[PDB]
Structure formats: structure tokens, C-alpha cells
Amino acid sequence: MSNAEAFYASIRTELESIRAAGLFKNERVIATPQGARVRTTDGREVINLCANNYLGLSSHPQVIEAAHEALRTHGFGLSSVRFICGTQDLHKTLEARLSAFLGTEDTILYGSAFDANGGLFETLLGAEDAVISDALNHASIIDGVRLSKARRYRYQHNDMDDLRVQLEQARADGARYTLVFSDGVFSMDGTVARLDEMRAICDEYGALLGIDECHATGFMGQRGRGTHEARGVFGKIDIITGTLGKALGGASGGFTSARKEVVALLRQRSRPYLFSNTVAPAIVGASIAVLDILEASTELRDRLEGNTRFFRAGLDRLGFDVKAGDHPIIPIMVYDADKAQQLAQRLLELGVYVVGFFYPVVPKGQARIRVQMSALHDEAALQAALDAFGQAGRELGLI
Template sequence: MTMQVEYSQEIGSPPKRNISDWDLNDKYLRLKKKSIRKLITLPPKYLGNLDKGIEEAIFRANQEVFNEFQGVPIAMGKKTLLQNVGTTIDDHAFIQFYVDLECVVFCPKVDKKVKAVVNKIGETYVNCLICDRINATIFKRSTEKNAKKSESVEDISMENSLNSLSIGDNILIKIKNIQYETDNIFITATKKIEKMKFFTKILRVNSLNFRNFSSPYSSAVALNNFKNHLNEQLNGIKKAGTFKNERVIITKQGSRIKVAGNQKEILNFCANNYLGLSSHPEVINAGKEALEKYGSGLSSVRFICGTQDIHKNLEKQISEFHGREDTILYASCFDANAGIFECLLTSEDAIISDELNHASIIDGIRLSKAKRYRYKHKNTSDLELQLQEVVKNGARFKMIVTDGVFSMDGNVAPLKEICDLADKYECLVYIDECHATGFFGATGRGTEEYLNIPREKIHIINSTLGKALGGAAGGYTTGCKEIVDILRQRSRPYLFSNTLPPAVVAGASKALELITKDTSLPNKVAENTARFRGKMEALGFTISGDNHAISPVMLGDAKLASDFADLMLNEGIYVIGFSYPVVPKGKARIRVQISASHSFEDIDECVAAFEKIGKQLKAI
């Protein structure tokens, strides 16, 4: 029987086996690029997938392939079928064709050094992989007594080198012998081994998963491949200009700080330290006293043995501050947002969320089985359309979810209109007040106070202790007793996270006490904000937001924002530029954050620097 199929085509390279994945100039990889015309014989099952058949025929580490390629094929480039004809062998039909191949071939030679990675260590041997593909074995010295007598100083030194190796070490070995088996090649290496301290990556290829590769494959190699995969992602982030470098502060957080590598004191206009309480002496002293009295931590979750009287007192303080029935503390507001939706709502319910809500809200909603709807940012007309759809689909409970203040733009949610729609469509209202609690509104009660919204209209408030209220850590949910009680029973971040450390609790408690007794701090934030915004707009800058301490200076161009921020630091002003994908394209800005700890002189110095750099870069 004869089958005949004639055509000529190019077949794409297999994923992650491209020639470009390998460094052909590295002499210790022993790689060569070769072009070869090969006769391929395959069973009929490969008629619909010749590419797979070629791979299985080529990627074999046996003597036949080795002799044909003068080495072991590691990767293929372009493959061109020249002729494809059927044939029979022992009355069985086969596909047989010629193909032109571009290959990377590993070409080992006896007495030559080659790079390898340790993937297995036994009592009598060290095993490693060459090119992520070929097994090499280094045998240790004999353990017999008569063998020990003949050991040289060099043998003992080499034995110590072998014993010092660990899984994943990158090494140079010298090839002593090459042995062929049916589907593999084993290389025996001499004991002359060099550990490569400064060589961090053997291969440029991400991951190779060769068929017919039956030898042990170490998890160390998997880690090496995974690190390469992560490095590709990191390089992509750097190329996009969104890699986040961390400046190291060597002083307390405050309006004036010092950073590592710069002895000059700089003005800080990018912290969430809205009230300047992060380093307030009374807050610090409260933390010290709690540390002495209550210890460093509880080593427990709340419901086992992690609740102290100071935790209950802080929860009571927060409830009274917001005018709610009860409060539950979390390790962070991210945890509070992650732990609320999945235990309050089910697949029978619906969440309607602003499209620009904080990432923690988005992640928390994803964990819930409730049906999810998004409305356009601050667009109550679109919100109503979504609510109509929710009603049409028969949701049991409906919850509108929004930030009170949106952190990237400093704009305020239209809570009055949202609450009106909640009344109309019988919805619960949830707000995240992280960028409002403690400093926004006449007495720092947040967005509902700023917009004069009755408390009964807002059913759930999530907020943080890590910004205005001491700046350390912690978050909370406050609302009716029933909501808080069910969260204590079911909220996973609460049930499975250590309780807040006593010093953090005491610091936040003192911060709340200071704000409650004296409203001058929130007033100072408002005065500083008005001064900064007014002077900047008078210079011709566009300031986004709604009279909030977050005062984005809109520049539009990403490079301009980055260069502007760098030059501001030279002037002693610490601000950060934001651009796509953190903000929409064409909306690059420098986000300035105003604090009560800033003096009018600080504000004026910052504005003067903006004026100087703005004119220098022709931004105004």
C-alpha cells in the first residue's frame, strides 16, 4: 500500500524551543547552529500534526540522532517540508518525507568544559543537567578503606568541592566519557569541577519539556526556568517604564525627611500621613506604653487568645467616632475589603461597583459569588441603568459599592445621588473611606460629613488606621451589630490572621483621641489644601480632584511627569509621577498629598519649585 501527499510549507517553531532562546556565543554551552536535510519517517497518526511528529523524531538523545547531527538537537528554527510521500514498512503504512531544518545542537567533546546545573546529589555521585537536557554524572571517590590510602591531596580537595555543592548550583565540568542509550545520553565528568559564583543563569530558554526525556528532572531546574520566566515579566515592566523603585527613608515619617544616599533634608508631599500623626510624640508614647504593658504581639487570632481590652476599646472608639453600632478590626483595610463581600452576599445577590474602585475592593468582590455589575466612574445615570438590570434579573439583596474619595484623582463620590438611588431601588450602600477618615469633613468624619449625608443612608464603612489615624497598620469595618457579628464568625482574613499588635492599637487609639478632642488638625489640612490648589492654579497648572488633600497636578505626558518628579527632588521636594497603565493614557500627573504637618512656608516652597520646574520644562 502506498500513500502520496505532495506539498511544501514552512512550519512554525515549537514554543520555547526557538534558536533565539540560546546563547550561541557562550563557548561553555558547546552549542552550534546547523542546517540539515533529514528524512523523517512517521506513523499515520501524525498526518494531522506533522510538526509534533518532527519534534519527536528530532528531540531524541540517542546515538542515531547524535551521529546524524554530530550532537544533540536542543532547539529548532525554521522547518520546511520538501516532499511528503507515503510508504509501507512490513505491511504497515508510514509517512515519509524530507525536511530542511535549522537547529541548535549541543556538541560535547571529551576533555572540554561545559556548563551544568546540579540537580541531584547522592552518596557516591553528583548528577547535573547540561542544556536542561542531558544527564551528566560526577562520581565521588570510593569509600573503601584501601581506596582511601591512595588518595592524593588533589583528590581530597576535589572531594571537598563536591561535598560543598547544593541543588541548583551552576558549575563547570570537564567531559570524560559519553555513553549512549536508547533514548538518552549520559556524560561522565571528571572531578575537576569549578563552582561558578558569578554565573547566575545557564540558559536563556524559559522551559523545555522534551518528549522521551526519562531521566530525573530536578526541582532546582524547574526553579531556574521559573526565575527566567519571572525575569522576562520584570524586564517587560521595566521596558514599559512602570517598574517601582523604592526610595529608602532614614528618618521618621513626617513633612521633612531624609532618604538614603542624600544628606539633604527634603519636603515630603507624597505620604498618606494626612494629619501628621505618624510621628506625633503622644502617638509614639502611647505605643511605647502599650509595648511595655501588653507585649509585642498576641501570637494568635482574635477568637482563640488574641483579644485584649485595648482591642475592644479601640473598636468602641471607632464605632462612636463614626456613629455606628459596632466595629471589627483587621490587619489592614485590604483585608477588611477582602473579607466582607464573600461572607455577606451569595449568588442570589448583586454588587454594583464603581469602575475605578480601589484594587482591594475589586479583589474582595471577585471572592464573592454575588453577581457583579460595574458602572462608569461617578456616573449615576449609568448606575441607575445597572440597577434596573439588577432588578430585572431578580437579585435578592443589592449593594452599591464605592470609594468615598478616589485615591488617584482626589475626587469625591456623588454620595447624595447614590443614596437617593439606593432608596429608590432598595439597596445597601458601602463606602471605603481610607482617604477620608480622620481629616476630610469639618471634624474628620469623612465623606458623609463633607457632603452632609445622614448616617443612616450609609450602611457599611470600611477604612484604615494606616493613613491619617497614626499611619502604622490596621483596618476596620463599622456598621450595624448584625453585620459585624457575622463578620466575626465568617470573615476569613479576620479568622485566620494574627490580631493587631498592641503598640499599633494604642497608637491608633491615641490618634482618634487627639482628633476627637481637637478639630484643628482636619481644619489645617483643608487650609493647606486650599492654599496649594489656589497658588498652583494661579500659575496655570491644572489640579484635578474636589478640594481634597490629594491634589494631582495634571501634565498629560508620561515622560514629562517622570522628568518633572526627578527635577523636583533636586529642588528638595519629594513627589511621585504617575502615568499609564496606573492612570489612563494622556492623563499622566504628579500626585501631591497635603498634610496638616505642612506649614504655609512648606506649601509655598513646594509651589515655588513647581513654578521653577514648570517653566524649565515649558509645562506652564
Template sequence: MQQQFDQRLRDNLDELSSRKLLKIEQEIVSPQSAQINLRAMGEREVLNMCANNYLGLANHQALVRAAHAGLERHGFGMSSVRFICGTHSVHRALERRLSEYLRREDTILFGSCFDANTGLFEALLDEHDAVISDSLNHASIIDGVRLCKAKRLRYANNDMGELESALREARHCRTVLVVTDGVFSMDGIGANLPGICDLAKRYGALVMVDDSHAVGFIGPGGRGTPARHGLEDRVDILTGTLGKALGGASGGYVSGRAEIIAWLRQRARPYLFSNSLMPALCEASLAAIDLAEDAEDLREKLTARTFQLRRGLSNLGFQVSGSDHPIVPLITGDAAIAVQISDYFLALGILVVPFSYPVVPQGAARIRMQVSAAHSAEEIERVIFAFRSARTHLGAGSPRSGS
């Protein structure tokens, strides 16, 4: 039995490898930044176009100093879950700071936003309720919805007609929760939050937003998509991460009304059964929020570099998803072409990663890049030139006229 099982896994891995779909983990031997050193490249420096390091804070010295100070003051780890003896004063301080920053009544910390999303639905909803989810929502939302007993409905991405149909279907349920990503991570597309909130109000539904790819750099003060649309008071539950714009380490949270957060402390399983965040991470996250709140210069630079890359690729005739977000997916359609581009770029000293099924739908393979405020205009021009060269040498990428 064991030999058959192991052989099946080897066969599956070989099949992925033969189709050039095997995910390869690049080993970094330097701090995370716009330029990183890869073990596979003989520790040579490459331009990094893959990280969620939107504000360039992942190796910011203010965060490094805060983490060092946190280690000295609080030690390394808590060795416990929150309700036993794992709640440190710095956990409470970070929860209060996030609540203040996001303009919410209360916040609860999780080990990751994946944990936050997988723990939320089961705790808040049961067979008397309904959850309505956008078709492009993150895997953590999909998994979290699967864990709860609520009626499950789905609508096509940003399709308000389908959302309204789902709301009508769920109108007899006790509580209806509409859940969406603030920004859809594989496409760089923002949610139609005004339309969602209007429909939710009309049908008496609650709204939840996972704002992982927005908080820190979108909206006034970087407070995210609800703030961008002036809808902070219309979103009932906000989840997010400390692992992207806010320092890039780890940790997630749920923010919302006090009653929601209080109940999650009693019933959210990833919170109840996982060790609390290390205190030094919380100290660094406090420093990251302070930086992000006043980082208009970094947000302006991020916007400029994003526009530069998107305009350059569009001028070359490539199909690029989204409009203004620093997630910049260049659609190839063919997975093999995406892999070819990735390999070609690595030889040029630029790290980009191909995405294909099952991460994205069949026939929708892409190179997903992420712009950082740490990137210079010269580095973005280098990426644009590399795509021009790849099209010439590989015939790679699908111009819009042929897609």
C-alpha cells in the same frame, strides 16, 4: 522551566526599566513627617509630598507615648488570631471607640483596610445577591468583589444614570450592595454620596463606603464623607484604615449595624486567619482618634495648605484633578514626563511620586501629591515654585489649554 520563568521576569523588569516605569522604593531613615531623610540622598532631608499623613500625626508624641505605654502594659504581639486567643481587651476598646466616633453600632478590626475590603463581600454576599461598584474604586474593593459569587455590575465614576441602570438590572436579586470610595485616591474626587444614597433608597439597595481618605479630617469631627453630607444613617457599611490620617501605622476596620459585624466575625476570612493587631498599635490608635476628633485647628490648616497648593498650580496653568481634597493629582498624561518631574524635584530636595498605567488608565499619568497639616505655607510655596521651574527647564506638565 525555572530558568525560563526567571528569564521572563527579568525581561519584564528590564522592559519596565527601559520605559522608566519601574517603581523605586525610597528608603527613609527618619520618622515619617513633612520633612524626611532619604538613604538615596545621603540621608539628606527632603520635603515629603507623598504621605497619607493628612493630620501630621504619624510621629505625634502623644501617639508615640501611647504606643510605648502599650508595649509596657500589653507586650509586643498576640501570636494568634482573634477567635483563638488573639483578642485583647485593647482590641475591644478600640472597636468600641471607633463605633462611638463613627456613630455605628459595632466595629471589627482587620490587619488593614485591604483585608477588610477583601473579606467583606465574600462573607456577606453570594450568587443570590448583586454588588454594584464605582469604576474608580480602590483595588482592594475590586479584589474583594472578585472573591464573592454575587452578580457584579459597574458604573462610570459618579455617573448616577449608569448607577440607576445597574440598580434596575439587579432589582430581582435578593440583596443589592452599592459600593464606593468616599474619596477616589488617584483623583482626589469625592463620591456623589447624596445621589448614591437617594438611588439606593429608591431601589431598596444597601450602601457601603470605603472612607480611608476621609476619616479624621473630612466632615464634622473628622467623621468622614457620610458625616460631611449628613448621611451617616443612610450608609450601611463603612470601611476605613488606621494607616492614614489616624496615625499612619496599619490596621483597618468595618463599622456598621451589629448583625453585619457579628456575621463578619464568623465568616470574614482575613479576620479568621490573620494575627490580631499588636496591642501597642491599638493604644496609639485610641490616642489618634482622641486627637482627630478635636483637631479643628489641624483640619483648618490642612484646608488652607490644600487651597494654597491647588490655587498655585491652577494659576500656573497645570491640570489638577479634584477640587478641595488634599490629594492633589497634577495630570501630565505622559508617563515619561511624570518621571522627569519626579527626578527633577528630587534633585531640588522634594519627594513626589509619578503614577502611570496600570495604577491609572493609559494616557492619564500624573504626579499625585498629598498635603499634610504638618506642611507650612513656605513649604507649599516651595513646591509651587518647583513646578514653575520644572515647566521652564523641562517643558513639563500639560497646561489646561493644551490638554
């Protein structure tokens, strides 16, 4: 047996173990644009309750038209990183528009928020510095942190007392600069980071405060600017990383927003910015149109908020165990991996598409169905979805 073929046998063995443990992820092949309803290649039509399409801009007509228009004016690809020939006027406009929207001095575009986080920490922090992360921070944050030389600390999820403990320990350990960093909204439980308390605690220690706003930009806060607006610390955030691929259009792109000197050093040294393609013109142009829409009217985020209240109230009424909160991410606790797999499959048969999370992604006993509201859904369709939850929940003994 050659080593190379043994390698492939070990890969196949691992895949079979995943299957046998019930952990294998199945891709359902969608035939339609993204929307409130979709249809797979086998003709099954479903209400879609597990997209990041919070404001319905993924297939909004003015967004699609801005994309067509930018293809005509600025082309399909730039085939270049930003410093060579990959910067259009579109990119500078979007960076300025995002800076104003988020309350920061400047913004640097990336291909994705995953790469914004990956390219963040290594440039800004070194071995004498500390990063203090919420224990449930997003994977892309951890990997950016692991690529840096920074000292690593974690505080218990949303635990301000433990955040103080970690800031105390980082100080005792002799940290030069300290960055407290957290998801603004955590996708697994929909909780909203306590940014007002974190800002005050950061100020006590002279620490920086950074947030990852992927599940917030566009609809958190009264004007939809983000978790920092909702928590009353708009303009008091050192670093915001975020995505264009969720509420703000759903195609691609991400960004880091900060003081102008941080953004400037990121352009000079951040490895995904130096060594990965610029954002495509059509995505940049559509994103400017997204900001035009969201700065003109709060109607879409107001509709998302009403849809979220309606669905949270209905699940509560039916008897489900729903994680507390008001976020469009609505986690329905079902404890067992098998119960979650059964509920997601039964809902699919009933015309409702959700996603389940279970061990080892979440702890034993913490299995859940993750529903995500959209401004797209109307309350009649949401009621039809609640009826499917009611049916499957009664069948499976959950309610």
C-alpha cells in the same frame, strides 16, 4: 532547560520589559521618621508631598507616647487570632470608639483595610446577590468582590445616571440583595463620591450602600468623621471599611463598621479575621489616643484644609492643570508618562518628593503627579515647594 529555570527566565524577561517600558518602580530608602520633611540614606533631604500622613499623627508626640505606654501595659505581640487569645480590652475599646466616631453600631478590626475589603463581600453576599462598584474602586475592593460569589456590576466613575442603569439591570437580573459600593474619596483623582445622591438612589431600589473611607476618615466632614459626614448622610451608611494606616496614625490596622449583626457575622466567618493575626497592642492603644486627639479638637484637620487651599491656589496661579476639587490629594495633570517621570525626577532634585502615575495605571494622556497635603507642613515650606514646581514646570514647558 528545566521547567523551573525557564520559569525564572520568564520572570527575568518580564522584569526587563517593565524596565524598558519605563514602568519600573524604585524604592527610595528613608533614614528618618515619617514627617513633613524626610531624608534618604544618601543624605538627600526633601519636603515630603506624597505621604498619607494627612494629620501629622504618624510621628505626633502623644501618639508615639501612647504607643510606648501600650507596649508597657499590653506587650509587643499577641501572636493569636481574635477568637483564640488575641482580643485584649484595648481591641474592644477601639472598636467601640470607632463605632461612635463613624456613626455605626459596631466595628470589627482587621490587620489592614486591604484585608477588611478582602474579608467583606464573601461573608455577606452570595451568588444570588449583586455588588455594584464605581469603575475606579480601589484594588482591594475588586479583590474582595472577586473572592465572593456575588454578581458583578460597574457604573461609570461618579456617574449617578449609570448607577441607576446598573441598579435597574441588577434588578432585572433578579438580584436578591444589592450592595452599591464605592471609595469615599478616590485616590487617583481626589474626587469625593456623591454619597448623598447614592443614598437616595439606593433607597429607591432598596439597595445597601457601602464605602471605603481610607482617604477620608479623620478629616473629611466638619468634625472629620468621613465623606458621609461631608455629604450629609452620617449614620445612613450600611458598611464602612477603612484604615488606621493613613490619617489615623499611619502604622497599621483597618476595620469594617456596620450594623451589629453584620459585624457579628464577620467575626464568625470572615477569613482574614479567623486566619490572620490580631492587631498589635501598641497600634490599638495609639489609635485610641488618635481618636482622643481628633474628638477633642478639629485644629489638625482645619490646618490640613488651609494647607490644601493654599497649595491648590498656588498651582492654579502657576498655570498647572489641576483636577477640580478641595481634597488634600491634588492631582497635577501632565498627560505624558515621560513628562510625569521627568517632572517627578526634577522635583526630587529640587528638594520635593512626589509620585507620578501614568499608563497603564491611568489611561494614555492622563498622566499626573499626585501631591498630598499634610497638617504638618507650614505655609513657608509649601511656598518653597511651589517655587520648585514653578521652576521645574517652566523648564519642562508645562507652564
